[PDB]
């Protein structure tokens, strides 16, 4: 008769990130709150968000 298979209700995903971890999006939550006088700006290049 016909067979059977274990029910695959789980999944596993692993993958090495190509670009390095950015970890710069926390710049908006620093302790030095800027002002409209200076309003310092930081550029993001080669990052992942």
């Amino acid at each position: 008769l016909s067979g059977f298979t274990v029910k695959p209700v789980a999944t596993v995903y692993r993958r090495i990130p190509n670009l390095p971890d950015c970890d710069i999006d926390n710049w908006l939550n620093n302790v030095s709150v800027p002002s409209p006088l200076n309003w310092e700006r930081r550029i993001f290049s080669n990052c992942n968000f």
């Binding site: 016909s2 067979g3 298979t5 695959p8």
Partner: protein
């Protein structure tokens, strides 16, 4: 004038290992979309 007795062995094959094949686990093991197309061929795996 003088004689002796010699020996000799011989092997004759008689049996063979029995192999069974299933289509439900070969082409369409655990995929439902595979079984839909396999049923189109009809009585093709029942002959095997």
């Amino acid at each position: 004038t003088n004689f002796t007795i010699a020996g000799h062995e011989e092997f004759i094959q008689t049996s063979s290992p029995k192999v069974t094949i299933d289509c439900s686990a070969f082409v369409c093991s655990n995929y439902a979309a595979c079984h839909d197309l396999l049923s189109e061929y009809g009585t093709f795996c029942d002959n095997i």
